[PDB]
Structure 1
Amino acid sequence: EAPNQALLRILKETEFKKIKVLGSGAFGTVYKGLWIPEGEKVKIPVAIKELATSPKANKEILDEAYVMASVDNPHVCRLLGICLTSTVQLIMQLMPFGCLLDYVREHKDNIGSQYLLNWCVQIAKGMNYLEDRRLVHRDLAARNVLVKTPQHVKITDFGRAKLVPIKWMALESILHRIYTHQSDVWSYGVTVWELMTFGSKPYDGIPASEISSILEKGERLPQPPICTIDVYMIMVKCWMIDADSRPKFRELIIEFSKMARDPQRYLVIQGDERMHLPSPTDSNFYEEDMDDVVDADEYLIP
């Protein structure tokens, strides 16, 4: 197929500064930082990811670097560069509001129908882009959707992306290790469920070994209280046995866009519209010299 002419930017250790740890886990360790390149007079807020110097960890992270450097869409996370230390770290855009899963849990009392429906549109757009680029994510979940601003989300974690999260997986994946754009659609359905429930754990308490049997019997995730039959019916279509019967991401963009034009017809939330989340038009929305600070989305290169 087509040659991948993406550029892999090697960044000097001296070009950036680690400020603090943002999070640790199975995924590794992610740090908050500032990237001050050459004599550019720019300060880019960044996130630095790394998993002992084991040859396997460097191999797996460089595989993620490959995919992350190959993507370029507003609703997908691109790699800014890599730093060749003993560990080898990924330099990415700082998403100041963290993952969407923690955001929906921590801000439920201020999340309205407009915000929820727009997130669904944005995830579908990012996902449709990955389909256009012939990439199968294989790990779409609310934990892998990061928040740049409450009005702007992006898909990340390309560590499993190809050209075990059982509770997010399509039945074909669990039983036969079959991954397609239509298996990502199933994971999209589960991600939407996580959002509408304000971060509930799918099939909470049920062990992963039971899931396969539960789905085979015809059991699916329940209808969230805020969801109209209109929104739940979409989620249900994402969880059909026949992958080709599931909607396409381009159809999910359309469906949720129509709904995002009249959000109170499709999501019933007590105290809707009166709710408000931070905006780039808010006071103190943007710790150091805020002079010369440029977001990665505005710091471009040929």
Structure 2
Amino acid sequence: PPQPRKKRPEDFKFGKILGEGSFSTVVLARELATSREYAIKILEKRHIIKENKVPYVTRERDVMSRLDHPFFVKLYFTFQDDEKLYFGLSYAKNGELLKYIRKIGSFDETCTRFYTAEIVSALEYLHGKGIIHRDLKPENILLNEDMHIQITDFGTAKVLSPSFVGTAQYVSPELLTEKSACKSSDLWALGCIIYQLVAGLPPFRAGNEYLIFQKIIKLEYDFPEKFFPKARDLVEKLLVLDATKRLGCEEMEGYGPLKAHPFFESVTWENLHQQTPPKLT
């Protein structure tokens, strides 16, 4: 089937910078012919080559192409000039989730349940496709116009066949003990995010990267008294040192028992994207 002739930088009115990575920068752009707002990720080839990140960029482009679900940022086009790589991404109008965490303090039982369910529904999909995020954090979970999640940053994503260490606060213990990640890394990360939604802060916190890692392996963290009981139980079934005993993994019989947890008693999994998100306090 004949696809539209490659896009060019000149087809856009580039605007404000939205994000700044080490290898990339994300710019808000408006397609002139169509009036559309894309989040264009700009990567400089020389730097990618120099810093030996070609397989990283390849993987990213390949993984985003494989994704087709409403809780994920979509890839529309890719084009390149003499010095840069451009990725045409979906523009989440309301930005990062961390913005809403920091802005309202911490989430109520209804909000924590709805966004947790959206993240679970998203991971069930991603894992269904045998893809692992490897760096799931509130900085990577964005909010669209509708206030529904849109997961991004697939640079570090890994496609399983039959390495990289993410953000310190969300690193699972096994990553510090064998340098090996699986579906269970993403479930440990989810355990942190939930703790972060209820208590307004990540679970493991310390003066530097070393003390954080020390806390993670020792499993040194504690629930504030003002924490929902049902959410507390869920967080304890996820922040488990034994990677094979995390609620949601294949050893634990997958996503069935996770979605089945009392903290999601009222959640209707089958149509979250169609549901009207609760008002953020």
User: Which structure's relative contact order is higher, taking Cα pairs within 8 Å and 6+ residues apart?
Assistant: 1
CA contact (8 A) 2:195 2:235 kept: yes
Q: What's the counterpart of residue 257 of structure 1?
A: 264
Inter-partner Cα distance in structure 2 for 1:70 and 1:176: 29
The alpha-carbon distance between structure 1 residues 8 and 252, as it changes in their structure 2 partners (threshold 3 A), is farther
The TM-score normalised by the length of structure 2 is: 0.79
The alpha-carbon distance between structure 1 residues 51 and 250, as it changes in their structure 2 partners (threshold 3 A), is farther
Q: What's the counterpart of residue 38 of structure 2?
A: 46
Q: Is 1:116–2:112 an aligned residue pair? A: yes
Inter-partner Cα distance in structure 2 for 1:157 and 1:8: 26
Q: Is 1:243–2:243 an aligned residue pair? A: yes
CA contact (8 A) 1:123 1:154 kept: no
Q: Is 1:209–2:210 an aligned residue pair? A: yes
The alpha-carbon distance between structure 1 residues 244 and 204, as it changes in their structure 2 partners (threshold 3 A), is closer
Q: What's the counterpart of residue 223 of structure 1?
A: 223
CA contact (8 A) 2:96 2:141 kept: yes
CA contact (8 A) 2:199 2:227 kept: no
CA contact (8 A) 2:96 2:143 kept: yes
CA contact (8 A) 1:122 1:154 kept: no
| Amino acid aligned to 1:35 | E
CA contact (8 A) 1:80 1:93 kept: yes
The alpha-carbon distance between structure 1 residues 197 and 118, as it changes in their structure 2 partners (threshold 3 A), is same
Pick which of 24-33 and 66-75 moved more: 24-33
Show the 5 A alignment for 1:1-302: 10-26=6-22, 28-36=24-32, 42-51=34-43, 53-56=46-49, 59=54, 60-85=56-81, 86-108=83-105, 112-149=108-145, 151-163=147-159, 164=165, 165-198=167-200, 200-220=201-221, 222-248=222-248, 249-255=255-261, 256-258=263-265, 260=267, 276-277=279-280
Secondary structure of 1:54's aligned partner: helix
**Structural RMSD (CA):** 2.8
Q: CA deviation at 1:257?
A: 3.3
Secondary structure of 1:98's aligned partner: coil
Q: CA deviation at 1:10?
A: 4.5
Percent identity between the two aligned chains: 24
The TM-score normalised by the length of structure 1 is: 0.74
Q: CA deviation at 1:50?
A: 2.5
| Amino acid aligned to 1:54 | H
Q: CA deviation at 1:132?
A: 0.5
Secondary structure of 1:126's aligned partner: helix
CA contact (8 A) 2:23 2:47 kept: no
CA contact (8 A) 1:77 1:156 kept: yes
CA contact (8 A) 1:97 1:103 kept: no
The alpha-carbon distance between structure 1 residues 97 and 253, as it changes in their structure 2 partners (threshold 3 A), is farther
Give unpaired runs (5+ residues) of structure 2. Answer: 160-164, 249-254, 269-277
What is the number of residues matched between the two proteins? Answer: 252
Q: What's the counterpart of residue 299 of structure 1?
A: none
